[PDB]
Symmetry: C4
Subunit: 388 residues, 4 copies
Amino acid sequence: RDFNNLTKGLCTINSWHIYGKDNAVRIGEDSDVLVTREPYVSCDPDECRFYALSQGTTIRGKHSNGTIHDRSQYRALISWPLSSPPTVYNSRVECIGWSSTSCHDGKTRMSICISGPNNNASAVIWYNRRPVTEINTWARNILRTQESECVCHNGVCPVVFTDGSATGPAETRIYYFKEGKILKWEPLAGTAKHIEECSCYGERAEITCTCRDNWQGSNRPVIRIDPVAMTHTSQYICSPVLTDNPRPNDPTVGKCNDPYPGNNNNGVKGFSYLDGVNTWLGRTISIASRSGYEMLKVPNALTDDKSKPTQGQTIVLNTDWSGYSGSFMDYWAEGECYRACFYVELIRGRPKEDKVWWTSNSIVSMCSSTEFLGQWDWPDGAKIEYFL
Amino acid sequence: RDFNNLTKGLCTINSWHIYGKDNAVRIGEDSDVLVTREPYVSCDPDECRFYALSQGTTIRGKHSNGTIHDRSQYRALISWPLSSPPTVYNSRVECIGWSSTSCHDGKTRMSICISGPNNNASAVIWYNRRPVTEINTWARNILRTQESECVCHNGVCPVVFTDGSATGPAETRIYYFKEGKILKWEPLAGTAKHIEECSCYGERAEITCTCRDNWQGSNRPVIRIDPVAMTHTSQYICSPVLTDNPRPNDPTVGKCNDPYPGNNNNGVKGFSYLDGVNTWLGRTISIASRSGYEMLKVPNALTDDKSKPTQGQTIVLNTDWSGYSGSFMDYWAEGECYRACFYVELIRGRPKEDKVWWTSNSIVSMCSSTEFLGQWDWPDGAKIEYFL
Amino acid sequence: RDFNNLTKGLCTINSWHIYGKDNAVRIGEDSDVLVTREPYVSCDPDECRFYALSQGTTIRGKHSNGTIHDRSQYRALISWPLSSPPTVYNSRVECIGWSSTSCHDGKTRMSICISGPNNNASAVIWYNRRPVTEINTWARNILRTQESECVCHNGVCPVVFTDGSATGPAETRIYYFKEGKILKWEPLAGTAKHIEECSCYGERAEITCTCRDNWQGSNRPVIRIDPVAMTHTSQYICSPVLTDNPRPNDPTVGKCNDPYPGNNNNGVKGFSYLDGVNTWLGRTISIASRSGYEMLKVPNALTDDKSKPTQGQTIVLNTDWSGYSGSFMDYWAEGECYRACFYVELIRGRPKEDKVWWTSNSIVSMCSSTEFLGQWDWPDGAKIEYFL
Amino acid sequence: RDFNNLTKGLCTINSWHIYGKDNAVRIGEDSDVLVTREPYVSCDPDECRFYALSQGTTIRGKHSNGTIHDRSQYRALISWPLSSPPTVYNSRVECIGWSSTSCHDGKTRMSICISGPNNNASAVIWYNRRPVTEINTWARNILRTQESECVCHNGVCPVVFTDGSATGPAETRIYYFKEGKILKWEPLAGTAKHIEECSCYGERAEITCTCRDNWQGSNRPVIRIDPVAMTHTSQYICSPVLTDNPRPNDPTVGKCNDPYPGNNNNGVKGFSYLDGVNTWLGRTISIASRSGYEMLKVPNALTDDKSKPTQGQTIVLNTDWSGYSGSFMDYWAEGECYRACFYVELIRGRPKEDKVWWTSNSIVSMCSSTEFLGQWDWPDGAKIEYFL
Ligand SMILES: *[C@@H]1O[C@H](CO)[C@@H](O[C@@H]2O[C@H](CO)[C@@H](O[C@@H]3O[C@H](CO[C@H]4O[C@H](CO)[C@@H](O)[C@H](O)[C@@H]4O)[C@@H](O)[C@H](O[C@H]4O[C@H](CO)[C@@H](O)[C@H](O)[C@@H]4O[C@H]4O[C@H](CO)[C@@H](O)[C@H](O)[C@@H]4O[C@H]4O[C@H](CO)[C@@H](O)[C@H](O)[C@@H]4O)[C@@H]3O)[C@H](O)[C@H]2NC(C)=O)[C@H](O)[C@H]1NC(C)=O
Ligand SMILES: *[C@@H]1O[C@H](CO)[C@@H](O[C@@H]2O[C@H](CO)[C@@H](O[C@@H]3O[C@H](CO[C@H]4O[C@H](CO)[C@@H](O)[C@H](O)[C@@H]4O)[C@@H](O)[C@H](O[C@H]4O[C@H](CO)[C@@H](O)[C@H](O)[C@@H]4O[C@H]4O[C@H](CO)[C@@H](O)[C@H](O)[C@@H]4O[C@H]4O[C@H](CO)[C@@H](O)[C@H](O)[C@@H]4O)[C@@H]3O)[C@H](O)[C@H]2NC(C)=O)[C@H](O)[C@H]1NC(C)=O
Ligand SMILES: *[C@@H]1O[C@H](CO)[C@@H](O[C@@H]2O[C@H](CO)[C@@H](O[C@@H]3O[C@H](CO[C@H]4O[C@H](CO)[C@@H](O)[C@H](O)[C@@H]4O)[C@@H](O)[C@H](O[C@H]4O[C@H](CO)[C@@H](O)[C@H](O)[C@@H]4O[C@H]4O[C@H](CO)[C@@H](O)[C@H](O)[C@@H]4O[C@H]4O[C@H](CO)[C@@H](O)[C@H](O)[C@@H]4O)[C@@H]3O)[C@H](O)[C@H]2NC(C)=O)[C@H](O)[C@H]1NC(C)=O
Ligand SMILES: *[C@@H]1O[C@H](CO)[C@@H](O[C@@H]2O[C@H](CO)[C@@H](O[C@@H]3O[C@H](CO[C@H]4O[C@H](CO)[C@@H](O)[C@H](O)[C@@H]4O)[C@@H](O)[C@H](O[C@H]4O[C@H](CO)[C@@H](O)[C@H](O)[C@@H]4O[C@H]4O[C@H](CO)[C@@H](O)[C@H](O)[C@@H]4O[C@H]4O[C@H](CO)[C@@H](O)[C@H](O)[C@@H]4O)[C@@H]3O)[C@H](O)[C@H]2NC(C)=O)[C@H](O)[C@H]1NC(C)=O
Ligand SMILES: *[C@@H]1O[C@H](CO)[C@@H](O[C@@H]2O[C@H](CO)[C@@H](O)[C@H](O)[C@H]2NC(C)=O)[C@H](O)[C@H]1NC(C)=O
Ligand SMILES: *[C@@H]1O[C@H](CO)[C@@H](O[C@@H]2O[C@H](CO)[C@@H](O)[C@H](O)[C@H]2NC(C)=O)[C@H](O)[C@H]1NC(C)=O
Ligand SMILES: CC(=O)N[C@H]1[C@H]([C@H](O)[C@H](O)CO)OC(C(=O)O)=C[C@@H]1N
Ligand SMILES: CC(=O)N[C@H]1[C@H]([C@H](O)[C@H](O)CO)OC(C(=O)O)=C[C@@H]1N
Ligand SMILES: CC(=O)N[C@H]1[C@H]([C@H](O)[C@H](O)CO)OC(C(=O)O)=C[C@@H]1N
Ligand SMILES: CC(=O)N[C@H]1[C@H]([C@H](O)[C@H](O)CO)OC(C(=O)O)=C[C@@H]1N
Ligand SMILES: *[C@@H]1O[C@H](CO)[C@@H](O)[C@H](O)[C@H]1NC(C)=O
Ligand SMILES: [Ca+2]
Ligand SMILES: [Ca+2]
Ligand SMILES: [Ca+2]
Ligand SMILES: [Ca+2]
Ligand SMILES: [Ca+2]
């Protein structure tokens, strides 16, 4: 109908309720489920669906051998019905590639997939399921993007891309698209020193993205975008509650405009909701590996370099595998506010479970509740031994 | 369009005709059919579908081992096309959880799923396929609900919940929802001493629910709800024709306001249609186990403590496994009356058939006919030996 | 929109072109294809689909053992997309039973399924995918119907049923339905001595049905129905070109009002298009078994007791298995005439191929052309040895 | 709505971006994927889909043995969602046959399938998913058509057919269809000496088809059609950059009105975009076999007998199997120009890989970009050894 506008603020997050779970790895042990990774969730005005990068083979298939690898010509962004697993028969291909983002602007959906060799990748921007614009690699070193949904406001859908080193300065750009066409792009500004895989959401005409500083930061960089002025700023979450992984132990004071040191050249896609006292941070429980997952209420985390938790909720036990996590919201729901949601990728197989030759995942997803709900843990649930 | 109103009375039940059957266990021996239990049927204005709690694995899958268990993080309420089996590829997830109810109000559908550990469960109420309201456990002891469809009248859809002991007094509440929001709730009143898994239907602006007194009753408790006044009453079916299971043999006089003694701490979800002489009771043939199933016409069963059968119809032979049963009707059919329908869950596997490591079921469903139709029996039809 | 009226006459049949083929048995050797038999084809105003009686198991499934049997509680009328095979995932259940018919009246579809034990069967008539009317067995001996589509005119859809002996006089009735309700029924009249499985079509406000005289006739009985007056007549095809099976060799003169003798208590569902010189008869090539299939142009076959072929077309070689055949037409196609079509059931497995424990089939379907097209043969195509 | 008119010219082709890829053979190693060959892509106003000739069996199925054969009664034109593989459950049958073409005229789709024995084949023309016209073989020697989409202009959809020898003069006809009916047909004219499998596209009210001269030409014949006047011309691509296969090495000067000699009685379906300097030719890299695939910009290739490449892009490495290739465009996309697209059939199995008993393929597809995008190679990706 009309372009969606970010007119509401976030609902008060007092806890998290279960939203979706596909149990993909459990089910795929004996059904035609595609091997995936880098999943996310994204809503259309009349439907919310799961998204991921397929590896172009089923989990039980012999071609599952080697799926720990990230970029092959057999990957594609696929989407499928909420909480169903990504099967050969119910998965819809949005575009071909090994890095992606996607979002609905209220009228139709824009999907972006990047493909190609490391030194010659290109992004193809799809709108209304048709290819509209293409962008060639500018730094010739793995052009890559969010791996979770973008956000739109009055037709303008900003997207964060990075091209260049994963272990030193890179070239990050913020592109402002409208109907799949480039309105404007700008180089990253602010104090964030390295940017990868931004997790974004919008409220009251502003888009907030929590990203990954792969190079040096154990705290997470934050990009705030004005989609009307088509400008942005960047900084780090000030709070000493560190949310990347691996990471050093939590200090008593964090860093606002520089990466918090201790771990270099590594990380994990993550997210946060930065809204004053209504601030919640997600993170793996383990500081060493993609193990466990918890939500922590950290009032003013973004601006308070001494902020610590006041409430929390465990999502995945430290005795279970987690992985990527990101933000999304149903911008077309009823009510006076946007209900914060997130998903956690539950990685199974390599490298942590190397008795199998594949690497895949399942998805668990939650949204906020104004109630103070009891908590449960949500593991992938598959028994690797069954696959041996 | 407009909210449905219960303006018609029940059609005269002179017999039962076959409505649906999915032969899920037979088919799933060699196709990707999900393991389920606690099924039911529910209609939308333009379609009627089967519903159940998936176990998040196929029957032939190795993860089917252990599906006798009731509450895991891998369960979800799913729905699929009438008489088709619940497959990985045709099952639509309504919400995540291990106890549920669902009903269409004429405009859209409300679905409720409860999840969590025994002492910290929560219900999430979905409306128009979006999460709208959440309710935390109030007694911290397996918050649970109907396991069959709810019923709506002018937008108000009452739902019966129980939290607390299964072997002593518990805390039952009747929630009145409208568009997924809580209008009102009240604690159970009347003479019913324990309430679980209510099976409901509506006619002439009144909703009748036949439930399960797990604690002490072999006769079934009944809750009658006024969805306009949002009030209710409760009692037991007076008739000496006992319908829970296990149960003692039938006496010559029943109990109207107290559980009929003989069997404690056990039961099975069941149902009835209480309409004067047009009263029909469903029950397992066996008084000891979930074996066989029959419909018995027992005029004034609800109010006559000496009422006995005047007609009957066998649905499943005592030599075949049955299980849960419940009520539903197509409130959007043509005609001057609502045609009473019901389903019977045909449980296969554990605990009765322990040569296999799983527990699942198939569904058989019937609706009333004004004719006096010949009867047939309707077994699950699978050969367990094939699964060995 | 509006009820369809049989306002056109048949197009001139100069040959037959391939319309549909599902290769179900070939494909099902390695995919989840349901075991079926008694198939047919039927059109809706916007789609034509394949129909059949499922056996409630896949062909490769262990429950395929024994599917030679006709009436079990695991059968159902299913429909699926034209030329696709009937799979677990794409088959839509129309109703439960082991004998059926179905037809669209222009507004919506009526489907009829009969189920039950031999002495207590009942038909349930569905309209707009809801059960509307039920008819109890009147002769208590396998109530049964067409096994191919019915035909409608201004809302009135006549259907031929038989109840009673398959080897002596039986009780045949013609029911006139409108919106699933019974307008009228009448007992069979005319000279046809036994009636089973009528294959019907309509043109110029008249419905012609070619049926099966199981008791004594090797020539086929014919019922012509006036759906406005709701009356009919019956006789036999006069032509000496005999079309039932098994049957004696062709004589030089046939019988118009009595069964042509030579073979008793057996037959096969078949069809014909009786339109003056534009008359075409279908039949198995073998006079002994359901082997091969051919179309023969026999001018005035219905009324000329000496009529012989003037043209022909082979559909299935005598070295290949055939089976049931029946008529259907797309009453909603463009043009000035109705294009005659038919399907042939290609039975595989028992009893002819007993190395396998199952019985199933695939479908081949043709429609007429005003051209004189070259002919090909259309076998099922599966290799039984592959199933061993 | 209204018939589509070819009102736009081609967009400037500066490179090719990835459009679709189904990885069918990889996925089908462990899922129910149909064996196919002769694929293509074609758009409807609201969707673009993959098309191919199924072999009526899955790849893992035992009936895959022998699928190197071209014309059996088990083949059919099927279509399925873009970039999904052709599975038993998602493939829609358009018609039955072993040679086809299909195209949308803006209102609805016309599909054509030819079937029958070599000396008695016939084409059936479907419109709006209904059979409308039939054409009998005129030369009684494998009536055959494009194997890629046709193109329409104001309702007129020309189609090129050939009947007769593959190794000497044959009888080629251009049929002009409108709503599935024959408006006119004409015999091939011009200097093209043999015509097979034309690959066509339209722009500015003209349809250009690049075909295959199986008899003698290593350069490709070209048919240009005026769909309004319903007339055409034919010639050969003048350029010395030869594009059929097998073929002799590239000379310095080609032939404009005669086949370039060196290879007889063989070839491969191919295509080109002939638009002045914006001219791009597709071809296998190998001159001996269907190995590799590249796009070459050859300004004025059609008219310049000395034209050589000025730019290029590799699509499939010479170390990987290719096969058929053809043109298609989304005539309903936004913008001021038509974006040239093509697909390449990646054949796997026999005859090149004879360790397996089958022959199948997967699809890769690209469209043009006005950018100068980095290139990647796109192999089928399956490991034959896995199928052993
Ligand atoms: C039924 O359900 C309800 C609803 O969920 C359950 O109630 C919930 O219970 C939760 C567990 O107790 C609780 O979550 C905790 O909340 C704490 C905050 O609340 C407390 O502090 C405030 C502040 O003054 C008070 O107002 C409040 O009353 C409480 O006292 C958090 O601080 C907790 O998080 C910390 O602990 C967990 C371990 O439990 C860690 O995993 C987590 O990361 C936090 O601790 C680390 O980080 C801090 C910050 O830097 C450090 O100070 C600390 O040392 C830890 O650091 C190590 O570990 C991290 C992670 O590995 C590593 O990076 C670092 O380097 C160090 O090694 C926790 O979030 C919910 O708030 C509560 N909800 C409600 C509504 O009450 C109820 O129990 C359930 N019922 C039953 C019967 O089970
Ligand atoms: C073709 O199809 C038609 C249509 O279905 C077939 O006709 C049907 O036939 C059915 C079987 O005969 C019949 O069903 C029975 O109806 C009886 C009621 O009708 C009779 O009584 C009235 C009352 O005066 C008369 O008007 C009427 O004319 C009849 O005489 C029921 O009473 C029957 O139910 C009881 O029996 C069955 C066993 O058959 C039990 O399973 C059932 O639970 C009932 O009996 C138990 O319960 C009562 C009540 O407390 C006790 O008194 C009794 O002792 C039993 O108790 C034991 O068992 C239970 C269950 O295990 C346990 O809990 C308890 O503790 C005790 O151990 C039965 O329902 C249909 O009405 C009839 N329909 C029609 C339209 O005619 C026809 O036969 C078919 N044709 C062929 C050729 O097959
Ligand atoms: C390319 O394609 C075209 C298009 O299809 C091919 O041309 C077609 O060729 C067909 C085969 O020749 C032909 O079909 C035959 O037509 C005959 C009728 O035409 C002839 O007679 C008339 C009458 O005067 C002439 O006008 C006309 O010119 C012809 O001469 C039919 O009579 C044929 O059917 C009979 O033969 C077949 C065997 O081929 C039987 O299976 C069939 O049942 C018919 O014969 C039985 O029945 C009759 C009637 O009672 C008996 O008299 C006879 O003895 C047989 O009885 C035995 O067998 C039956 C069945 O088993 C059993 O029940 C009984 O008891 C006995 O045992 C046949 O239909 C098409 O018309 C023709 N089409 C066109 C447009 O030309 C062309 O060949 C192809 N090209 C190539 C190169 O292959
Ligand atoms: C990142 O991505 C970009 C974008 O893709 C990459 O840049 C691309 O690089 C490509 C490879 O270098 C390049 O493709 C080539 O372009 C040549 C044309 O450009 C050149 O010539 C013009 C003309 O004066 C100049 O303006 C221009 O500056 C260049 O110098 C083509 O000629 C090339 O094709 C020929 O070579 C390939 C082998 O590489 C053959 O496979 C192909 O068939 C062509 O050669 C055959 O045919 C000709 C014509 O008859 C014969 O003369 C020749 O001998 C060959 O004949 C043999 O082989 C054929 C085929 O087997 C056989 O039939 C025959 O009989 C003989 O045996 C080639 O197309 C892109 O244009 C370029 N794109 C851009 C935008 O720059 C960049 O490299 C990537 N970056 C990295 C770091 O990898
Ligand atoms: C989001 O905000 C913009 C207003 O800036 C709205 O876009 C007006 O919408 C109407 C209805 O289609 C048009 O007549 C105006 O020209 C629109 N655009 C502008 C840029 O002024 C848009 O309607 C809002 N979205 C929603 C859902 O209300
Ligand atoms: C089939 O024939 C009957 C006419 O007997 C048509 O039914 C008239 O249709 C209009 C349009 O809905 C109504 O106003 C009349 O009352 C209809 N019925 C009768 C019984 O008179 C019907 O329209 C015809 N079907 C088609 C497709 O034309
Ligand atoms: C485009 C690409 O390959 N992205 C990969 C990502 C990057 O390798 C990482 O962010 C460093 O640049 O890492 C991870 C990862 O699991 O850490 C997965 C992504 N597939
Ligand atoms: C929420 C829950 O676990 N409900 C279970 C139910 C209860 O255990 C029973 O009603 C006693 O409370 O029993 C049964 C049962 O088969 O008896 C199945 C239900 N899964
Ligand atoms: C209802 C029923 O069982 N109909 C069967 C039919 C009858 O047995 C036959 O027409 C005699 O009555 O025969 C055949 C048959 O193959 O001859 C199949 C049908 N399933
Ligand atoms: C109708 C038909 O059989 N067409 C076939 C085609 C022809 O054999 C070829 O064009 C020569 O006529 O060749 C090829 C081929 O791979 O070369 C495939 C087609 N199936
Ligand atoms: C099929 O069933 C028969 C009868 O029960 C049995 O003797 C036979 O061995 C079975 N065949 C298979 C393959 O199970
Ligand atoms: Ca980091
Ligand atoms: Ca399988
Ligand atoms: Ca009880
Ligand atoms: Ca007979
Ligand atoms: Ca050639």
